[PDB]
A paper describes a structure:
[name] is a 170 kDa type I transmembrane receptor composed of an extracellular region characterized by four domains (I, II, III and IV), a transmembrane region, and an intracellular region composed of a kinase domain and a C-terminal tail. Ligand binding to the [name] ectodomain is coupled to both homo- and heterodimerization, which is followed by conformational rearrangements of the transmembrane region and asymmetric dimerization of the intracellular kinase domains, one of which phosphorylates the other to initiate signaling. The [name] nanobody, selected from the VHH library directed against [name] for its non-agonistic and non-antagonistic properties, was proposed to bind to [name] domain I while not competing with EGF binding, but no structural information is available on [name] or its interaction with [name]. Here we report crystal structures of the [name] nanobody, alone (up to 1.48 Å resolution) and in complex with the full extracellular region of EGF-bound [name] (up to 6.0 Å resolution).
The [name] crystal diffracted to a maximum resolution of 1.48 Å. Model building and refinement led to a final model with Rwork/Rfree of 0.177/0.205. Two [name] molecules are present in the asymmetric unit that align with a root mean square deviation (RMSD) of 0.17 Å. The framework regions of [name], defined as the conserved segments of nanobodies, align with that of a typical VHH with a RMSD of 0.51 Å, whereas a RMSD of 3.9 Å is measured when aligning the complementarity determining regions (CDR). Two complementarity-determining regions of [name], CDR2 and CDR3, of which CDR3 is substantially shorter than other [name]-interacting nanobodies, are at the interface with [name].
Residue numbers in the entry:
A (entry chain B): 1 to 125
B (entry chain A): 1 to 130
The structure:
Amino acid sequence: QVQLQESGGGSVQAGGSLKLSCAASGRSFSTYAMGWFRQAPGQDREFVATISWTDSTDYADSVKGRFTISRDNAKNTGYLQMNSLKPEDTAVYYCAADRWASSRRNVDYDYWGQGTQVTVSSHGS
Amino acid sequence: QVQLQESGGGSVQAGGSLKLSCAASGRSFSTYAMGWFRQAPGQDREFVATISWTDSTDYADSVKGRFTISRDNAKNTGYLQMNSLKPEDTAVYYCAADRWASSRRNVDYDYWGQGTQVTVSSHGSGLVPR
Ligand SMILES: [Zn+2]
Ligand SMILES: [Zn+2]
């Protein structure tokens, strides 16, 4: 089992950047896949990116070329670098982990953080 | 002569990251030094970082190892990547440009943006990184 804690959220101008971190506590972090999901109010919790135990990555089409997922097993930490942020990215961002799956389905991850709020302004504001 | 506009500011959790951009309008952007300066409440506009027209960099001791200044001459844009943000970093951040400046002095830069606000939460709100 792992416990996860996200950090790095904020409220930024469109086109800006943020970096989210997810700090894991528990045994065998290197054996977990890590996922990022996001939920806007009155919307379903959606796949953003995942990284496998071998650093194989997967991204939603909506964030390809803008977001980068990574991990540092020595720090038991995962990261989501978010560049060229858009108002469509506003949401609570959750990190999730699982040893038995590495998919784009939220039901396939059994360990979740509490979430970090990301807010992005309108375009050209 | 260039016109500058900063973007990318915001409010962020202590320990987080931002990236500020400075878009320049005008001729010969690649011939200008670009500086970032910041003004916290009750403070003067202080040097943060500069990049010369030959890509030579200079950082304030308070941001060395956390901030990275860069430029994209093809996009007439400069950048300030800010990692491991601290409450000490809360300020209005200004970009400045000059063809004839090789100093940390705000009087050596003749072209200024209007500023972008950066607000970092309290130290206590930050986690202990591994
Ligand atoms: Zn599972
Ligand atoms: Zn000058």
